[PDB]
A paper describes a structure:
Prions, the causative agent of TSEs, are composed of polymeric fibrillar assemblies of misfolded host-encoded cellular prion protein (PrPC) that propagate by fiber elongation and fission. Biologically distinct prion strains can, however, be serially propagated in identical hosts expressing the same PrPC and produce different disease phenotypes. Rungs of the fibrils are composed of single PrP monomers that fold to create distinct N-terminal and C-terminal lobes with the N-linked glycans and glycosylphosphatidylinositol (GPI) anchor projecting from the C-terminal lobe. In this study, we determined the near-atomic resolution cryo-EM structure of infectious, ex vivo mouse prion fibrils from the ME7 prion strain and compared this with the RML fibril structure.
Numbering used by the authors:
A (entry chain C), B (entry chain A), C (entry chain B): 94 to 229
The structure:
């Protein structure tokens, strides 16, 4: 004989942003031949009555990851790598408040001239040769 | 004999952004021959009576990942890589408030001249030769 | 003998953005021969009574992923890569408020001249030869 009763009264339940999996990653340049990991979300969430018996689950798992990097004659040049440039700013900022004023003069002057040439990420490369043969 | 009763009273239940799987990734340049991971979202959520018995599930799992990178003659040039450039800004900003004023003069003046040449991501490359043979 | 009763009272239930799978990925340049991961969303959400017995599911799973990168004579040039450029802005901004004013003068003056040449993503490449043979 097996009995299960579930009588919750006004069970307000919220599940926001639960069990999310995300496999990602940023790669700039490099010589390849690499492996990025996987993402697994496997939660068991239970409310109420759970009854289990005489089962056999989730056995004999294997996760063999192999990276075999065997180049023979590899010639490479890697120059001027950057990931990202964020929140570069130049500003002239004024905040003026006057709750109550009489017979007053306010003047705001903002000058910008020849402020900048480059703000970020200026990349220059002239002569790159992975293999150069200039004998004699 | 088996019995399952489920009598919740006003069970307000909310599930938002649950069990999402996202496989992604950004790659700039590189020499290839790589593997990015997968995303698995596998949650079990139960609100009530759960009864299981004499079952056999989720066995004999294998996840073999091989990256085999064997180039023989590889000549490569990689120059001037960037992922992204975000939130670059130049601004002249004024905020003026006058709740109550009499016989007043306000002046806002803004001049911008020759401010910038390149705000970001300027890439220049002149001479690249993966293999160069200039004998004699 | 088996019995299952499900008599919830006013069960307000909401499922929003549940069990979404998204396989994506951005690649700029590179030498190919890669593999991007997959997305699997496989949730089990149950309200009420669940009764399982003498079952056999989800066994003998294999996920063989192989990347085999074996070029022989690979010559390549990669120059001036960028993924994206976002939120580049130049602005002159003024916010003036006068809840109650009498006999006042307000002036807003904004000039822009020669402000910028390029905002972002300026790419220049002159001479690229994967294989160059200039013997004698």
């Amino acid at each position: 004989t097996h009995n299960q009763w579930n009588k919750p009264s006004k069970p307000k339940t919220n599940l926001k942003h639960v069990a999310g999996a995300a496999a990602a990653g940023a790669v700039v340049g490099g010589l390849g031949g690499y492996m990025l990991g996987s993402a697994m979300s496997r939660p068991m969430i239970h409310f109420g009555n759970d009854w289990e018996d005489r089962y056999y689950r989730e056995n004999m798992y294997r996760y063999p990851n192999q990276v075999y990097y065997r180049p023979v004659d590899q010639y490479s040049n890697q120059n001027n790598f950057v990931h990202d440039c964020v929140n570069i700013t130049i500003k002239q900022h004024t905040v003026t408040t006057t709750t109550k004023g009489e017979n007053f003069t306010e003047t705001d002057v903002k000058m910008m001239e020849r402020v900048v040439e480059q703000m970020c990420v200026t990349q220059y490369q002239k002569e790159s040769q992975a293999y150069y043969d200039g004998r004699r």
